[PDB]
Amino acid sequence: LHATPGMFVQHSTAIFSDRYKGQRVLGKGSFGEVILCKDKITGQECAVKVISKRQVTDKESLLREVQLLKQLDHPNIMKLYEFFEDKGYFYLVMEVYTGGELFDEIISRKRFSEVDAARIIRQVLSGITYMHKNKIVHRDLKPENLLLESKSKDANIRIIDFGLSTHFEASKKMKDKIGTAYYIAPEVLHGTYDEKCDVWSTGVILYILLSGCPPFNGANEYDILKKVEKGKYTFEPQWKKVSESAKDLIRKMLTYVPSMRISARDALDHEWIQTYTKEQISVDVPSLDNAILNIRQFQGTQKLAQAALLYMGSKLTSQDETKELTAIFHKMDKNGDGQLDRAELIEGYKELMRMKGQDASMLDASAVEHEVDQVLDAVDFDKNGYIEYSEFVTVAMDRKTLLSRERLERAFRMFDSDNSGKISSTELATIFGVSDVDSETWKSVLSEVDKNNDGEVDFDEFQQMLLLCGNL
Numbered sequence: 001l002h003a004t005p006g007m008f009v010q011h012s013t014a015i016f017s018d019r020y021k022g023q024r025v026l027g028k029g030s031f032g033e034v035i036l037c038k039d040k041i042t043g044q045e046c047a048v049k050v051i052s053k054r055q056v057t058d059k060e061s062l063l064r065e066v067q068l069l070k071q072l073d074h075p076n077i078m079k080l081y082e083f084f085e086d087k088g089y090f091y092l093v094m095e096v097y098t099g100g101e102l103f104d105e106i107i108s109r110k111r112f113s114e115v116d117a118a119r120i121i122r123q124v125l126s127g128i129t130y131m132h133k134n135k136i137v138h139r140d141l142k143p144e145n146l147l148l149e150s151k152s153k154d155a156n157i158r159i160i161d162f163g164l165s166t167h168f169e170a171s172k173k174m175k176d177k178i179g180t181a182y183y184i185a186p187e188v189l190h191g192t193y194d195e196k197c198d199v200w201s202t203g204v205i206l207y208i209l210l211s212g213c214p215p216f217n218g219a220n221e222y223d224i225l226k227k228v229e230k231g232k233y234t235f236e237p238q239w240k241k242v243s244e245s246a247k248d249l250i251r252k253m254l255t256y257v258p259s260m261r262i263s264a265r266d267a268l269d270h271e272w273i274q275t276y277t278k279e280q281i282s283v284d285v286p287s288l289d290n291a292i293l294n295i296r297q298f299q300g301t302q303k304l305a306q307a308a309l310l311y312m313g314s315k316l317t318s319q320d321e322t323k324e325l326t327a328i329f330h331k332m333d334k335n336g337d338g339q340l341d342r343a344e345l346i347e348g349y350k351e352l353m354r355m356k357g358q359d360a361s362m363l364d365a366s367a368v369e370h371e372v373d374q375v376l377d378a379v380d381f382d383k384n385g386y387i388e389y390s391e392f393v394t395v396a397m398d399r400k401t402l403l404s405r406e407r408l409e410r411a412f413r414m415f416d417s418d419n420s421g422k423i424s425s426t427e428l429a430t431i432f433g434v435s436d437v438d439s440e441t442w443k444s445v446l447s448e449v450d451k452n453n454d455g456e457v458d459f460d461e462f463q464q465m466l467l468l469c470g471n472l
């Protein structure tokens with residue numbers, strides 16, 4: 001029973017209009033197709049893409065895209081909350097990003113300084129390192145598909161639009177000639193390729209950030225593709241002030257032969273990306289102490305509670321609500337790939353001890369390793385060996401703060417699929433995407449939670465489960 005944020009995406013049995021209220025339109029696309037909506041229960045704002053069935057094989061491709069978004073949890077990848085379908089429409093309910101496309105920043109300035117470009121490309125590369133590690137290739141990276149989270153000058157980047165994305169395998173190469181002319185890798189046009197195609201597109205973006213201009217240009221799509229296919233580019237007047245390090249990274253990402261082209265991971269490790277700032281994220285002792293405290297108290301959580309907390313943490317908390325936790329996550333993620341590993345958690349504990357002025361030799365040699373092994377197992381909801389962003393936020397967040405009245409109510413209705421007012425073992429099975437929950441799993445829920453002995457969990461019991469007979 002692996003819990004992931006993606007298991008909640010298509011799980012509601014409710015109709016869209018019973019969960020969301022439309023406000024204003026959003027974006028610069030066809031009018032009314034993306035709408036800012038409010039969650040009727042929590043008040044959470046979201047961006048809804050409404051697709052008419054008149055406008056979509058196409059149904060299959062939309063579903064594939066939803067399936068891919070359900071498998072990705074990363075601070076630089078768009079978050080999908082929910083997906084609804086009715087007789088007339090599909091509704092893609094997404095986290096709202098209000099800073100506009102990177103494309104619009106580009107066309108409103110001459111070019112980016114190296115430091116501003118490095119911050120952007122570092123985030124893109126974190127996103128794609130993570131994607132590639134999860135066997136997913138984007139295939140349409142470009143500035144139109146990179147949204148800034150807000151208008152704040154320090155807004156993060158989110159990779160959007162997975163409409164061309166697919167899984168890839170080591171054994172079988174990809175063949176579909178798919179992409180956008182300025183950004184598409186030559187081997188994609190030749191028709192045999194792998195995930196290095198995303199690295200090339202990111203190299204094109206970087207070249208544009210630093211110069212203002214595409215490396216392969218021309219009067220029309222046909223002319224652009226002819227330059228792309230040859231692969232010849234030049235650093236031809238702005239380039240005189242650009243550092244040798246920046247050029248070196250571009251040379252490596254626009255390396256023509258794909259077997260010789262740098263990987264996303266190695267590009268994330270490039271000296272230009274690694275050393276563009278020495279500024280440290282500010283995290284005070286009390287916030288880190290509290291986060292660690294919360295994480296280490298999580299062992300022993302039963303399966304209904306676990307799924308309910310992950311739902312609330314991964315779907316019902318905004319960026320504003322999780323500011324402090326997000327900073328701690330990025331500080332602990334030493335290799336900047338947007339996932340926490342065993343070695344990174346170990347270092348996080350040693351960091352905390354140093355910060356608190358604790359003497360580390362007062363513990364057994366492997367005390368920290370033993371701690372992290374227990375903690376990691378417990379907090380790794382999908383058991384893939386990493387702490388993803390949403391797993392981290394869920395567990396590290398102050399529990400009383402997470403368990404608001406509205407979040408509790410939303411979470412209960414999400415589990416109670418038939419609206420009977422009680423959660424059954426079979427509703428537990430369905431949320432985890434399995435046929436049946438075994439007797440031991442359900443019995444361990446009931447022995448703690450089923451206070452009236454009826455074999456199901458009502459709203460009262462569900463609140464008490466999470467809150468000392470708490471009820472909001």
Ligand SMILES: Nc1ncnc2c1ncn2[C@@H]1O[C@H](COP(=O)(O)OP(=O)(O)NP(=O)(O)O)[C@@H](O)[C@H]1O
Nearest residue numbers: 026027028029030034047049094095096097098101
């Ligand atoms: N999660 C989001 N939050 C806020 N705005 C978004 C989000 N996703 C897309 N938009 C914007 O809504 C507009 C249309 O979105 P989308 O439906 O993705 O466009 P499209 O059909 O792919 N072609 P285009 O709209 O020209 O990019 C664009 O301005 C997007 O930037």
Ligand SMILES: [Ca+2]
Nearest residue numbers: 333335337339
């Ligand atoms: Ca990491």
Ligand SMILES: [Ca+2]
Nearest residue numbers: 380384386388
């Ligand atoms: Ca995990």
Ligand SMILES: [Ca+2]
Nearest residue numbers: 416418420422
């Ligand atoms: Ca029920």
Ligand SMILES: [Ca+2]
Nearest residue numbers: 450454456457
């Ligand atoms: Ca009961």
